[PDB]
């Protein structure tokens, strides 16, 4: 039925999460002048222009004038984009003739079958830059003599309900469809962002609604539905605390999206500088209905040693408990970049150490290492010969 | 109250020299007289303490009565200390007479180019505090009363609710219908440096001593109006322990008591 509570706990305590914000047309941002990128200025402009409009609905002169200037810049910018598109169209006609531009094929790596044997089907005329973006989906094991591309992934992003490029609701939809004679894999995910207040007109409060549905017909005769609602306010218990809360509800509905097992969980996140230690911690608890699971993560940074990286993670299930510690360090030596990662798992009393070295010149590693590995292989083969 | 503050017939005589209720019979010079204890049947009987000799040039069981009297500005402070060595018991009474905190604020008039001070002085300007000690390890009787006019107290609270609290209060509360009108009635807008509410002549006396009772305060509201029959204090007292209502009409030191004890 519903996946192990361990999956839900891990998904909840991903880490500190920053939600998506508004998008600015940029033609009206400087009223037709060069502008830099600031999150505060963009947010303020969307609310300011909406507020000035609201006031200009009533007979306030200064408001009416400020809104009028925005409209003039908005009309000028739009017409300029229209003219540029009309021109670029004609210039492209001359550059390529009546023949349309053809896109590049998709690389699939070495195969015993002739290279680019089927490249003709992966080259097509470029579309007229529609809203949706199409990405092909492949499989680990393809057919013996055919391309392994089954189905497509479609992504759409927008910001509807904006009056003049100001305001609206950040939106996002992503659907993957793989219809086949025996398979119907439809997996979907949607995100909506609501902004309540902005730093100049008050606190910065944002809310994210996420809804994901997964259905596979040949394997499961049921659809898994999941919803999540999160609220993040900057500076709940500090100047810039960035603390946030969230709720998650997943039901494996039979289709009947009503009668199904239901897993419900809650999460919270918080950042805090104490002395020389910066901390980013996220905790979460989920119950299935009954299994109860607890999970938290904690990234700790030390000012005196910036290079050292410290992550801690603990999971408790009910009775059963387990935690792990990961440390990371990087340096350079012998004209080569080194990175050492040390992971400790207390539940199994095992220590793992992993070092990765990259050299751009001199092959120094080959002389300084890998001499024992060759020796043992030679001895093994030589012993077999004996 | 102030009558209770100095009920001693000897200390009252000492004050005169420095210059149902029976006055103390005291004659003094350069302190001493007799204990004329007040009695509220057909006749009345006074007490008699032979050791009434009191001498404070610098201002049974023998006694040492020393009185400390210092008054600065609008604040007046009297301390009456009696010490009996054989008894090993000390009776100390300290009273304070100060207006206390003021809602009024100093204002600057640009045209005058001088500060305008709230020179106006509340008539009471008195916050009586009463606290006597029996003299044993744990014997004390405190009868402090809000001498400060009830109106003077109401103004300080209303000024606090206006300037400091209203800004903090959220708007969804103001969304409630008819609430802003009631708030406006409750909190009038300040005019000049004058009070928002002009309540005067109303006083609040509470009598409650921890040794005397665990939880029985006597609530006494006093109205002192000159217009009513050419003056006269109408005090209503509610004693919870005796279930007694003490309606009183004291004018020019008259003693009255419509005891309603049940």
């Amino acid at each position: 039925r519903l996946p192990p509570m361990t999956f839900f706990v891990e998904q909840m305590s991903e880490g500190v999460l920053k939600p998506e914000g508004w998008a600015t047309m940029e033609t009206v941002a400087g009223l037709g002048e060069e502008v830099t990128e600031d999150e505060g200025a963009e947010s303020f402009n969307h609310v300011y222009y909406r507020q000035m409009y609201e006031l200009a609905v009533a007979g306030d002169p200064w408001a009416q004038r400020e809104y009028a200037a925005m409209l003039r810049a908005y009309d000028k910018g739009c017409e300029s984009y229209r003219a540029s598109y009309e021109e670029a169209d004609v210039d492209a006609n001359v550059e390529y003739g009546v023949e349309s531009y053809v896109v590049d094929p998709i690389d699939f790596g070495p195969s015993f079958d002739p290279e680019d044997m089927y490249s003709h089907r992966h080259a097509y005329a470029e579309a007229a830059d529609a809203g949706v973006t199409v990405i092909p989906s492949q499989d680990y094991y393809g057919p013996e003599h055919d391309d392994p591309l089954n189905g497509i992934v479609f992504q759409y992003e927008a910001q509807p309900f904006s009056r003049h490029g100001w305001g609206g609701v950040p939106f996002d939809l992503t659907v993957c469809c793989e219809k086949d004679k025996t398979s119907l894999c439809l997996q979907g995910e949607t995100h909506v962002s609501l902004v309540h207040s902005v730093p100049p007109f008050g606190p910065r409060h944002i809310t994210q609604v996420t809804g994901s549905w997964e259905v596979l017909r040949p394997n499961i005769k049921d659809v898994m539905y999941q919803l999540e609602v999160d609220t993040f306010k900057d500076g709940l218990l500090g100047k810039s605390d960035h603390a946030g809360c969230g709720l998650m509800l997943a039901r494996l509905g039979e289709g009947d999206p009503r009668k199904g097992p239901t897993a419900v969980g809650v999460r919270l996140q918080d950042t805090l500088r104490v002395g020389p230690f910066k901390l980013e911690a996220c905790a979460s608890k989920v119950a299935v209905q009954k299994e109860e699971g607890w999970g938290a993560r904690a990234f700790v940074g030390y000012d005196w040693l910036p290079g050292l990286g410290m992550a801690f993670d603990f999971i408790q299930e009910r009775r059963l408990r387990g935690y792990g510690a990961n440390f990371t360090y990087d340096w350079e030596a012998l004209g080569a970049a080194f990175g050492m990662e040390v992971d400790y798992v207390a539940a199994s009393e095992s220590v793992f150490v992993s070092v990765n070295a990259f050299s751009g010149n001199d092959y120094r590693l080959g002389w300084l290492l890998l001499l024992p590995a060759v020796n043992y292989f030679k001895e093994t083969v030589s012993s077999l010969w004996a | 109250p102030r009558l209770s503050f100095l009920p001693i017939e000897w200390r009252s005589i000492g004050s005169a020299f420095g210059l149902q209720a029976d006055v103390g019979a005291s004659l003094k010079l350069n302190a001493i007289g007799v204990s004329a204890s007040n009695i509220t049947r057909s006749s009345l009987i006074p007490s008699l303490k032979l050791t009434a000799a009191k001498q404070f040039k610098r201002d049974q069981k023998p006694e040492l009565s020393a009185c400390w009297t210092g008054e600065a500005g609008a604040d007046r402070a009297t301390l009456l200390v009696n010490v009996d060595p054989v008894m090993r018991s000390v009776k100390l009474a300290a009273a304070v007479r100060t207006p206390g905190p003021e809602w009024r604020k100093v204002l600057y008039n640009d045209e005058t180019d001088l500060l305008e001070y709230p020179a106006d002085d509340g008539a009471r300007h008195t916050l009586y505090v009463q606290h006597e000690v029996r003299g044993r390890d744990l014997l004390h009787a405190t009868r402090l009363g809000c001498r400060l006019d009830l109106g003077r107290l109401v103004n300080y609270v209303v000024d606090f609710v206006d300037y400091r609290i209203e800004e903090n209060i959220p708007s969804f509360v103001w969304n409630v219908p008819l609430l802003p009108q009631l708030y406006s009635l409750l909190v009038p807008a300040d005019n000049d440096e004058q009070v928002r509410h002009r309540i005067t002549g109303w006083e609040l006396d509470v009598s409650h001593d921890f040794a005397r009772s665990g939880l029985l305060p006597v609530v006494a509201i006093s109205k002192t109006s000159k217009k009513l029959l050419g003056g006269g204090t109408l005090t209503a007292s509610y004693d919870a322990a005796a279930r007694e209502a003490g309606v009183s009409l004291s004018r020019k030191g008259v003693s009255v008591g419509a005891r309603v004890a049940r």
Partner: peptide, 24 residues
């Protein structure tokens, strides 16, 4: 219990609604 403590922490972070307009 750990469950109760986590639920209480979730209730505490629910103060965002109190910080914003509440009981419209």
């Amino acid at each position: 219990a750990a469950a109760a403590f986590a639920f209480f922490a979730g209730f505490a972070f629910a103060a965002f609604a109190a910080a914003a307009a509440a009981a419209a």
